[PDB]
Amino acid sequence: MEPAAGSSMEPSADWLATAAARGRVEEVRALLEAGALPNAPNSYGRRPIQVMMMGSARVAELLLLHGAEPNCADPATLTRPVHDAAREGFLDTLVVLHRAGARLDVRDAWGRLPVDLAEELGHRDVARYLRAAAGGTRGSNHARIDAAEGPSDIPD
């Protein structure tokens, strides 16, 4: 197909994602501000922020504030972007997610939580804030449910 004029049809959003995965805030900052798609389908079946290197909450800010996928996850393992933040121990990213719109009480298909991963890798700062917004729960029985909608006068 004679390209270089009518080809392309490129949802140049892949860049805001690839640049994010490469820890490139400046690249995404200008890209998305230039027209980068906020919800573009990548080849990794991952959202535009779940693949932002998780080493620069700034990337999630532009993306999230622009319309990233801080809520939607993967239909294969339900990996929400909430895990990606705690996975690298980045609490700044968690704030942006809950600062604009991001469900932090999901599961990784298998049954693990974003707060359970942080406590295992050593991201206490994120596992703590996660147990508050992500797993907003306590213990014992009765109250706001007392804990992860399960252990209480509620069997699940």
Side-chain angles (χ1 to χ4, degrees), residues 8-35:
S8 276
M9 296 177 294
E10 227 192 339
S12 244
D14 276 54
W15 282 8
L16 84 94
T18 21
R22 260 183 187 191
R24 231 107 217 221
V25 179
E26 286 203 40
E27 225 89 20
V28 183
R29 227 85 118 86
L31 266 159
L32 245 143
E33 249 185 326

Side-chain angles (χ1 to χ4, degrees), residues 79-97:
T79 317
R80 221 139 191 132
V82 174
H83 297 58
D84 279 70
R87 240 269 251 187
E88 228 90 296
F90 227 104
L91 227 180
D92 275 35
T93 295
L94 272 95
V95 181
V96 182
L97 270 127

Side-chain angles (χ1 to χ4, degrees), residues 111-121 127 130:
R112 259 174 188 205
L113 270 128
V115 67
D116 223 39
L117 240 145
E119 267 213 37
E120 240 192 292
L121 273 139
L130 276 176

Side-chain angles (χ1 to χ4, degrees), residues 103-125:
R103 180 148 193 145
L104 294 121
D105 202 33
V106 86
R107 301 192 279 197
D108 249 36
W110 269 248
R112 259 174 188 205
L113 270 128
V115 67
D116 223 39
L117 240 145
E119 267 213 37
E120 240 192 292
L121 273 139
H123 305 300
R124 292 174 75 127
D125 286 312

Side-chain angles (χ1 to χ4, degrees), residues 104-105 113 115 127-139 144-149:
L104 294 121
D105 202 33
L113 270 128
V115 67
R128 222 175 174 206
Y129 184 85
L130 276 176
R131 218 161 135 217
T137 49
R138 291 133 193 69
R144 173 262 137 152
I145 191 273
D146 102 56
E149 308 178 55

